[PDB]
Design an enzyme around this catalytic site. Sequence first.
Site, PDB file in Angstrom:
ATOM      1  N   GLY A   1      -4.807   1.524   7.180  1.00  0.00           N
ATOM      2  CA  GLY A   1      -6.391   1.370   7.420  1.00  0.00           C
ATOM      3  C   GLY A   1      -6.510   1.620   5.703  1.00  0.00           C
ATOM      4  O   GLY A   1      -5.673   1.848   5.155  1.00  0.00           O
ATOM      5  N   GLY A   2      -8.063   1.446   5.571  1.00  0.00           N
ATOM      6  CA  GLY A   2      -8.198   1.445   3.992  1.00  0.00           C
ATOM      7  C   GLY A   2      -8.560   2.937   3.722  1.00  0.00           C
ATOM      8  O   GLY A   2      -7.639   3.836   3.955  1.00  0.00           O
TER       9      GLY A   2
ATOM     10  N   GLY B   1     -23.419  16.727  -2.715  1.00  0.00           N
ATOM     11  CA  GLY B   1     -24.346  15.226  -2.977  1.00  0.00           C
ATOM     12  C   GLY B   1     -25.286  14.883  -1.834  1.00  0.00           C
ATOM     13  O   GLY B   1     -25.213  15.395  -0.602  1.00  0.00           O
TER      14      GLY B   1
ATOM     15  N   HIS C   1     -36.484  -8.455  28.214  1.00  0.00           N
ATOM     16  CA  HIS C   1     -37.316  -6.946  28.325  1.00  0.00           C
ATOM     17  C   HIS C   1     -36.562  -6.271  29.483  1.00  0.00           C
ATOM     18  O   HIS C   1     -36.293  -6.914  30.552  1.00  0.00           O
ATOM     19  CB  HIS C   1     -38.709  -7.134  28.875  1.00  0.00           C
TER      20      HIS C   1
ATOM     21  N   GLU D   1       0.865  -1.488   0.043  1.00  0.00           N
ATOM     22  CA  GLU D   1       0.053   0.162   0.056  1.00  0.00           C
ATOM     23  C   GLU D   1       0.718   1.327  -0.122  1.00  0.00           C
ATOM     24  O   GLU D   1       1.582   1.541   0.851  1.00  0.00           O
ATOM     25  CB  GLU D   1      -0.979   0.137   1.203  1.00  0.00           C
TER      26      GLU D   1
HETATM   27  C1  FAD Z   1     -36.369  -3.382  41.161  1.00  0.00           C
HETATM   28  C2  FAD Z   1     -36.555  -4.373  40.376  1.00  0.00           C
HETATM   29  C3  FAD Z   1     -36.131  -4.464  39.288  1.00  0.00           C
HETATM   30  C4  FAD Z   1     -36.543  -5.439  38.284  1.00  0.00           C
HETATM   31  N1  FAD Z   1     -35.809  -5.435  37.020  1.00  0.00           N
HETATM   32  C5  FAD Z   1     -36.111  -6.098  36.065  1.00  0.00           C
HETATM   33  C6  FAD Z   1     -35.491  -6.075  34.768  1.00  0.00           C
HETATM   34  O1  FAD Z   1     -34.691  -5.098  34.367  1.00  0.00           O
HETATM   35  N2  FAD Z   1     -36.013  -7.092  33.738  1.00  0.00           N
HETATM   36  C7  FAD Z   1     -36.808  -8.054  34.105  1.00  0.00           C
HETATM   37  O2  FAD Z   1     -37.095  -8.923  33.424  1.00  0.00           O
HETATM   38  N3  FAD Z   1     -37.284  -8.058  35.354  1.00  0.00           N
HETATM   39  C8  FAD Z   1     -37.073  -7.479  36.392  1.00  0.00           C
HETATM   40  N4  FAD Z   1     -37.550  -7.353  37.620  1.00  0.00           N
HETATM   41  C9  FAD Z   1     -38.568  -8.527  37.822  1.00  0.00           C
HETATM   42  C10 FAD Z   1     -39.917  -8.421  36.850  1.00  0.00           C
HETATM   43  O3  FAD Z   1     -40.427  -7.051  37.085  1.00  0.00           O
HETATM   44  C11 FAD Z   1     -40.828  -9.652  37.358  1.00  0.00           C
HETATM   45  O4  FAD Z   1     -40.157 -10.803  36.943  1.00  0.00           O
HETATM   46  C12 FAD Z   1     -42.280  -9.427  36.305  1.00  0.00           C
HETATM   47  O5  FAD Z   1     -42.934  -8.318  36.738  1.00  0.00           O
HETATM   48  C13 FAD Z   1     -43.049 -10.773  37.032  1.00  0.00           C
HETATM   49  O6  FAD Z   1     -44.650 -10.468  36.339  1.00  0.00           O
HETATM   50  P1  FAD Z   1     -45.463 -10.819  36.896  1.00  0.00           P
HETATM   51  O7  FAD Z   1     -46.723 -11.276  35.773  1.00  0.00           O
HETATM   52  O8  FAD Z   1     -45.522 -12.019  37.754  1.00  0.00           O
HETATM   53  O9  FAD Z   1     -46.164  -9.653  37.487  1.00  0.00           O
HETATM   54  P2  FAD Z   1     -45.853  -9.088  38.927  1.00  0.00           P
HETATM   55  O10 FAD Z   1     -46.003  -7.589  38.619  1.00  0.00           O
HETATM   56  O11 FAD Z   1     -45.173  -9.471  39.733  1.00  0.00           O
HETATM   57  O12 FAD Z   1     -47.417  -9.130  39.621  1.00  0.00           O
HETATM   58  C14 FAD Z   1     -48.631  -8.497  39.165  1.00  0.00           C
HETATM   59  C15 FAD Z   1     -49.690  -7.841  40.309  1.00  0.00           C
HETATM   60  O13 FAD Z   1     -50.188  -8.698  41.056  1.00  0.00           O
HETATM   61  C16 FAD Z   1     -50.917  -7.652  41.803  1.00  0.00           C
HETATM   62  N5  FAD Z   1     -51.561  -8.699  42.841  1.00  0.00           N
HETATM   63  C17 FAD Z   1     -51.123  -9.505  43.804  1.00  0.00           C
HETATM   64  N6  FAD Z   1     -51.834 -10.256  44.564  1.00  0.00           N
HETATM   65  C18 FAD Z   1     -53.252  -9.658  44.039  1.00  0.00           C
HETATM   66  C19 FAD Z   1     -54.702 -10.095  44.351  1.00  0.00           C
HETATM   67  N7  FAD Z   1     -54.967 -10.830  45.173  1.00  0.00           N
HETATM   68  N8  FAD Z   1     -55.600  -9.646  43.680  1.00  0.00           N
HETATM   69  C20 FAD Z   1     -55.349  -8.239  42.964  1.00  0.00           C
HETATM   70  N9  FAD Z   1     -54.043  -8.075  42.544  1.00  0.00           N
HETATM   71  C21 FAD Z   1     -52.930  -8.587  43.222  1.00  0.00           C
HETATM   72  C22 FAD Z   1     -49.609  -7.058  42.384  1.00  0.00           C
HETATM   73  O14 FAD Z   1     -50.190  -5.722  42.978  1.00  0.00           O
HETATM   74  C23 FAD Z   1     -48.808  -6.983  41.197  1.00  0.00           C
HETATM   75  O15 FAD Z   1     -48.222  -5.431  40.798  1.00  0.00           O
HETATM   76  C24 FAD Z   1     -37.226  -6.580  38.581  1.00  0.00           C
HETATM   77  C25 FAD Z   1     -37.800  -6.589  39.951  1.00  0.00           C
HETATM   78  C26 FAD Z   1     -37.616  -5.423  40.745  1.00  0.00           C
HETATM   79  C27 FAD Z   1     -38.098  -5.679  42.076  1.00  0.00           C
HETATM   80  C1  FAD Z   2     -16.357   9.645   3.869  1.00  0.00           C
HETATM   81  C2  FAD Z   2     -16.718   8.111   3.932  1.00  0.00           C
HETATM   82  C3  FAD Z   2     -17.331   7.483   4.668  1.00  0.00           C
HETATM   83  C4  FAD Z   2     -17.628   5.839   4.834  1.00  0.00           C
HETATM   84  N1  FAD Z   2     -18.488   5.311   5.529  1.00  0.00           N
HETATM   85  C5  FAD Z   2     -18.525   3.973   5.441  1.00  0.00           C
HETATM   86  C6  FAD Z   2     -19.673   3.385   6.392  1.00  0.00           C
HETATM   87  O1  FAD Z   2     -19.959   4.047   7.435  1.00  0.00           O
HETATM   88  N2  FAD Z   2     -19.634   2.051   6.258  1.00  0.00           N
HETATM   89  C7  FAD Z   2     -19.067   1.353   5.217  1.00  0.00           C
HETATM   90  O2  FAD Z   2     -19.396   0.590   5.312  1.00  0.00           O
HETATM   91  N3  FAD Z   2     -18.471   1.905   4.196  1.00  0.00           N
HETATM   92  C8  FAD Z   2     -18.175   3.322   4.292  1.00  0.00           C
HETATM   93  N4  FAD Z   2     -17.539   3.873   3.465  1.00  0.00           N
HETATM   94  C9  FAD Z   2     -16.782   3.061   2.187  1.00  0.00           C
HETATM   95  C10 FAD Z   2     -15.690   2.221   2.552  1.00  0.00           C
HETATM   96  O3  FAD Z   2     -14.662   3.065   3.346  1.00  0.00           O
HETATM   97  C11 FAD Z   2     -15.343   1.660   1.225  1.00  0.00           C
HETATM   98  O4  FAD Z   2     -16.256   0.777   0.938  1.00  0.00           O
HETATM   99  C12 FAD Z   2     -13.832   0.545   1.806  1.00  0.00           C
HETATM  100  O5  FAD Z   2     -13.026   1.206   2.261  1.00  0.00           O
HETATM  101  C13 FAD Z   2     -13.602  -0.171   0.359  1.00  0.00           C
HETATM  102  O6  FAD Z   2     -12.515  -1.074   0.624  1.00  0.00           O
HETATM  103  P1  FAD Z   2     -11.256  -1.301  -0.091  1.00  0.00           P
HETATM  104  O7  FAD Z   2     -11.091  -2.687   0.335  1.00  0.00           O
HETATM  105  O8  FAD Z   2     -11.773  -1.340  -1.600  1.00  0.00           O
HETATM  106  O9  FAD Z   2     -10.612  -0.301   0.192  1.00  0.00           O
HETATM  107  P2  FAD Z   2      -9.983   1.087  -0.008  1.00  0.00           P
HETATM  108  O10 FAD Z   2      -9.550   1.869   1.125  1.00  0.00           O
HETATM  109  O11 FAD Z   2     -10.771   1.866  -0.926  1.00  0.00           O
HETATM  110  O12 FAD Z   2      -8.866   1.187  -0.807  1.00  0.00           O
HETATM  111  C14 FAD Z   2      -7.480   0.410  -0.316  1.00  0.00           C
HETATM  112  C15 FAD Z   2      -6.520   1.176  -0.476  1.00  0.00           C
HETATM  113  O13 FAD Z   2      -5.575   1.126  -1.843  1.00  0.00           O
HETATM  114  C16 FAD Z   2      -4.590   1.967  -1.838  1.00  0.00           C
HETATM  115  N5  FAD Z   2      -4.096   1.880  -3.201  1.00  0.00           N
HETATM  116  C17 FAD Z   2      -4.625   2.029  -4.150  1.00  0.00           C
HETATM  117  N6  FAD Z   2      -4.146   1.967  -5.637  1.00  0.00           N
HETATM  118  C18 FAD Z   2      -2.807   1.561  -5.029  1.00  0.00           C
HETATM  119  C19 FAD Z   2      -1.580   1.220  -5.903  1.00  0.00           C
HETATM  120  N7  FAD Z   2      -1.196   1.170  -7.066  1.00  0.00           N
HETATM  121  N8  FAD Z   2      -0.601   0.878  -4.556  1.00  0.00           N
HETATM  122  C20 FAD Z   2      -0.735   0.924  -3.496  1.00  0.00           C
HETATM  123  N9  FAD Z   2      -1.528   1.231  -2.824  1.00  0.00           N
HETATM  124  C21 FAD Z   2      -2.740   1.573  -3.392  1.00  0.00           C
HETATM  125  C22 FAD Z   2      -5.272   3.200  -1.519  1.00  0.00           C
HETATM  126  O14 FAD Z   2      -4.311   4.153  -0.672  1.00  0.00           O
HETATM  127  C23 FAD Z   2      -6.349   2.802  -0.490  1.00  0.00           C
HETATM  128  O15 FAD Z   2      -6.402   3.209   0.869  1.00  0.00           O
HETATM  129  C24 FAD Z   2     -17.201   5.281   3.436  1.00  0.00           C
HETATM  130  C25 FAD Z   2     -16.220   6.054   2.654  1.00  0.00           C
HETATM  131  C26 FAD Z   2     -16.084   7.450   2.771  1.00  0.00           C
HETATM  132  C27 FAD Z   2     -15.181   7.908   1.587  1.00  0.00           C
END
Ligand code: FAD
Ligand code: FAD
Lengths: 467, 467
Positions: A39-40, A181, A446, A33
Amino acid sequence: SDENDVVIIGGGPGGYVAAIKAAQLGFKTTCIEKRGALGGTCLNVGCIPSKALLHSSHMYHEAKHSFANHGVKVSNVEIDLAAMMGQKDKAVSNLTRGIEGLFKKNKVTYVKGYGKFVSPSEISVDTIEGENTVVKGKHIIIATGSDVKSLPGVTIDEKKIVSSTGALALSEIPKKLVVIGAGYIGLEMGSVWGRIGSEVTVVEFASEIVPTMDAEIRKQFQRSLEKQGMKFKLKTKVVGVDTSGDGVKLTVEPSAGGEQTIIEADVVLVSAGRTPFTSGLNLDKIGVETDKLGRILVNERFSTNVSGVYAIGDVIPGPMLAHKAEEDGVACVEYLAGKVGHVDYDKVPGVVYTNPEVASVGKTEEQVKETGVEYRVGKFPFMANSRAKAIDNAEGLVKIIAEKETDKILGVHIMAPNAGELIHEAAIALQYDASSEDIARVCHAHPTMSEAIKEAAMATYDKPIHI
Amino acid sequence: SDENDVVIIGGGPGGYVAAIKAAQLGFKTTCIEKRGALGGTCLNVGCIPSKALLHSSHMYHEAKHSFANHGVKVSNVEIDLAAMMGQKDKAVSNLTRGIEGLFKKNKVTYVKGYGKFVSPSEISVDTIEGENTVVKGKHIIIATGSDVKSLPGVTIDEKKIVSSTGALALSEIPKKLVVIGAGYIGLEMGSVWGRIGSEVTVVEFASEIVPTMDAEIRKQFQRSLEKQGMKFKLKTKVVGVDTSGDGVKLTVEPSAGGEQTIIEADVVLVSAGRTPFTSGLNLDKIGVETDKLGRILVNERFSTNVSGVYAIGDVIPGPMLAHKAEEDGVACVEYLAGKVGHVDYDKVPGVVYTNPEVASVGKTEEQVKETGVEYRVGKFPFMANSRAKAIDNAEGLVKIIAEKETDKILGVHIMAPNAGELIHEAAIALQYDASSEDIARVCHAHPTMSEAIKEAAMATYDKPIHI
Ligand SMILES: Cc1cc2nc3c(=O)[nH]c(=O)nc-3n(C[C@H](O)[C@H](O)[C@H](O)COP(=O)(O)OP(=O)(O)OC[C@H]3O[C@@H](n4cnc5c(N)ncnc54)[C@H](O)[C@@H]3O)c2cc1C
Ligand SMILES: Cc1cc2nc3c(=O)[nH]c(=O)nc-3n(C[C@H](O)[C@H](O)[C@H](O)COP(=O)(O)OP(=O)(O)OC[C@H]3O[C@@H](n4cnc5c(N)ncnc54)[C@H](O)[C@@H]3O)c2cc1C
């Protein structure tokens, strides 16, 4: 004799992967290169740099607008532009070293220089100091890349009229900026600077913004690109650019009714397209056949007319993305090694990293229509997603397309922050010709943004449980 | 009256989904719930509230530490604790309304009140200074939930010593805080307030924090929580407490190396476990199975040791998570509807929403060891993920576990931020007994955190291209 088995002219995704995969398959390999680092285009002037800025600009924005609603009260909020470009650069390089260090691990011989074919099997490498090094192999993989699409009446300086590179490296937040563009790289810069402070406006010649994007999604995506400042001057060509003043004077007259108008702008980002890059490759001596544009013609096994020469990446037909590139490299090497290589540009995802990202895999509703096949559509907005709401970051929607008869998923488009991570769950299901039901049959954690995809799936073959 | 088909005593995930899935299936359904609002617990004092805080407390953290590096300057940062609790509350209710509004859509008859079995076909609702509503139906799904747990130093009283709930609604960032339980919930609150300004310390009786977590991952996870400021205390417990005025006076005694030491505090979070909650309802009547640590014993179709009656959610055996619950309710109803309902607690994902989240699905290496089956492990750190480095948020790793012979995936564990989204890619592959290679064959969008999963896969059956 340690006879060299593979040479790759190109140090980017297609190259350094092909290079590496090659070494791992047991081939003496030499990537070559001319650029400074390994890098490319992705590593030095695109993805990475671009992604980096995109996230710094976002932090800035979220800090000036969201923090409030959460109890994070700040006093003043600014932008040390000098810094930003810093971690960007810090990151880019860092990344690069690691690659160079990957080459060392796998025994890829790194030859800094500019290749030029001297024969279907031998390459003369241009300059390290003005010399000539001779690299020879049984199989050669062209992996040159792509470069900037020129625009007819707008020469690019590096000054107030920039390219991809210039845009990622301005040294002053422009007051008014205009992006010519209107595709992904464009919308992306537009966002960057815009969040930072600029006043941006995009000027496309085409009917809509980002043509490949699914219509329904596009609509809402633009609207969002708008809702939060941005403006598009659609269907408009530009006679002549004017640079004899403060900023840049544009004389934009539509793509027909020749009645010019003038846009005032500090910097103008030229995001026209990108073209393959073969220039200066010694391409004549053995003459590999190219097509109308420039991409290098190739077959199933990625071989050129010239027995011994291959081409992969942004130089051959196919979508111009880094992973498409990576994908060819490997496919190519697997073949060379005698295994079976697998490509498939119909499942190479697409992701715009704008505020709401927009990740898509599979076909667009538009394309499905074209196939006259009977389909169903499922949709689910993050406005109903527990996680989203719990966070107050609910812009967005999952949208899946399936065959009505089979339920086979056709495409899945997503518009949302971190969409690029979410589209994978769809991308994998799409790889194995799976159906909505199948992905809905999977138990999701979730609360998560992923739940949306599950809900969109249900909404497809049956009926959603939260809308 | 249009309610007699299906009766559900519980407004949580198990109940309101059961309730909605039912109406969707063709049953006149009725959910009855004593609590104020219709969220489950995973809505009024659990999941959600918890996630909300987590994110807010993260934003605060990140703005005091990360922003700089990205060229974002803030002059003074502070916490409008009053605001935070707010967004939280705003969000909570906001979701609840939607649930209530979901019942209106599918036609679930919401009956505010406190259920109580009067017969395998009738239960006695009523109230606190209220009537006594009347619902009796054929099939009855018990869906009461779960609740806090005791200990020899408990004080289930609002502000001095807290529960899950108290902790989520303090009204004063405590200087020194101690969390007794040391698992899911505990680490979460300890993280929320620790960010905000509290000095926390977790005291667990168990050898290690979070037992169900894969060793290797636990190792690093802890080390991570460790630098963020928490001080864990293991092998010990509290025998003496002290509500004497200003704060508690914890007396730390270990396993039986017994002695006397003291933990002075400004509030104590008691995160011991959670018990099923079968009170209210009447079981002492129709002799139902209550034979374990308090759980309501059940069969394949989710039927109790009794006809017409059913049970699901945190009241039955299995993991205590919202989507597990969600999962039962639906499998239960589908059965009643004469379709096949299918559950799988071995594929119900686990996610701890701490700074680095930690999501796991399938089995842990220790579990896989116990099976004595030859296996291979794949890993790949984010430190080498381009997206990740480009952002400067690369803590964590992806680790896959496969059968050496087949390559079938046995488990996937991910420690990383936004790891709860990433895991679904694994989650869905593990649902269909797929292989490392399978998920590696999938084309991933570059640059995304998702690539790490693709790399960790290849690193399993073959060899990765970036490490
Ligand atoms: C702080 C914290 C963070 C959590 N974070 C996550 C997380 O990020 N991701 C995840 O997947 N899980 C998480 N969980 C656990 C998740 O919330 C529970 O697994 C999920 O809600 C259980 O669903 P469920 O259908 O049993 O309902 P639950 O909500 O447990 O219960 C259903 C409802 O039944 C009602 N109920 C109870 N008895 C009676 C009755 N006799 N009559 C009428 N209504 C009644 C209650 O008031 C209750 O709200 C977390 C729990 C806690 C405490
Ligand atoms: C501004 C910008 C943003 C982009 N963003 C994305 C993106 O987000 N996601 C994505 O997938 N693509 C993106 N692309 C395109 C991506 O960079 C190209 O598709 C990829 O680099 C093409 O790979 P290539 O293998 O052909 O290499 P290239 O990098 O194009 O070329 C390989 C190298 O060949 C060298 N070379 C050429 N002729 C000769 C020679 N005779 N002797 C020695 N060395 C030589 C050059 O210096 C060059 O760096 C972007 C391009 C631009 C310009």
